[PDB]
Amino acid sequence: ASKLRAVLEKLKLSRDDISTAAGMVKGVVDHLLLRLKCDSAFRGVGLLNTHVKISAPNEFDVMFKLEVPRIQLEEYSNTRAYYFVKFNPLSQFLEGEILSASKMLSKFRKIIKEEINDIKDTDVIMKRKSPAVTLLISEKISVDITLALESKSSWPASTQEGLRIQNWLSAKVRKQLRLKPFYLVPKQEETWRLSFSHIEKEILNNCCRKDCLKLMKYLLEQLKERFKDKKHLDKFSSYHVKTAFFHVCTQNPQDSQWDRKDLGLCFDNCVTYFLQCLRTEKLENYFIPEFNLFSSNLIDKRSKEFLTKQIEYERNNEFPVFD
Known part of the structure; x- marks a missing residue:
């Protein structure tokens, strides 16, 4: 913390x-x-x-x-x-x-x-x-x-079962966002x-939620910088991290679960789920549920296994890349 x-x-x-x-x-x-x-x-x-x-x-x-x-x-x-x-x-x-x-x-x-x-x-x-x-x-x-x-x-048919922000925020908000272009x-x-770049920005406006995303984003940025000479972490992006974060926000809808005091815990849970997605090769698009962002076609198992190693190493050693 x-x-x-x-x-x-x-x-x-x-x-x-x-x-x-x-x-x-x-x-x-x-x-x-x-x-x-x-x-x-x-x-x-x-x-x-x-x-x-x-x-x-x-x-x-x-x-x-x-x-x-x-x-x-x-x-x-x-x-x-x-x-x-x-x-x-x-x-x-x-x-x-x-x-x-x-x-x-x-x-x-x-x-x-x-x-x-x-x-x-x-x-x-x-x-x-x-x-x-x-x-x-x-x-x-x-x-x-x-x-x-x-x-x-x-919006297209494939979006119908996306943007699951009913329990987290509200169903009236979801409807409002689906009226936007x-x-x-x-x-x-x-x-x-x-x-859905616009929809990503929308939910930032409406805790340690945005703080967890900032750290999670910065973690990827710093890992990409360290291994920029290698051609492994070039495939990944802030969208992958932000998509994974939204899934954790759905799973944890209550504001009590994102208390300012529990930064390290909330951050660890956000890290943990992103690691789960890399292992399982299952990061569903938050708007297109069927569309898997960590599909073997887009990102090979080599890149995911490599990222899994680094992020685990970072957490185990209190995030050396931060200091």
């Missing part, structure tokens, strides 16, 4: 340092939006605030939402996650009715690659590669730009994966 609270301080000591880089990123993304709106295709483009999400102190993530004027979806095979987008506008990115993910990004990447040349007293170069447009602002600040399709229609991002058979 003492060391965990000392780590939570180090996180507060890091966020105020990013205040500079936040403005540098915020300045560049605004430039790109000004041009994209001029284009007839990305005319209804906007920023979905997540201010911008942080993966590491020099690693940012931004998402450009584009409200497609009414869409129709077809579930590719029985993936429950990857769908086809079909259809006057956005007719250049069509393979008949099929909306091409490749074409959309190919246009998206070019337009951005034109604008980065514009200085604004700032250096910015693109890394060609992967559903995101990666940009290195100056020489340190990295930004992964993603293009998502905002749909204000009802859902987004499709690319990932190659020209199929679009679902995303």
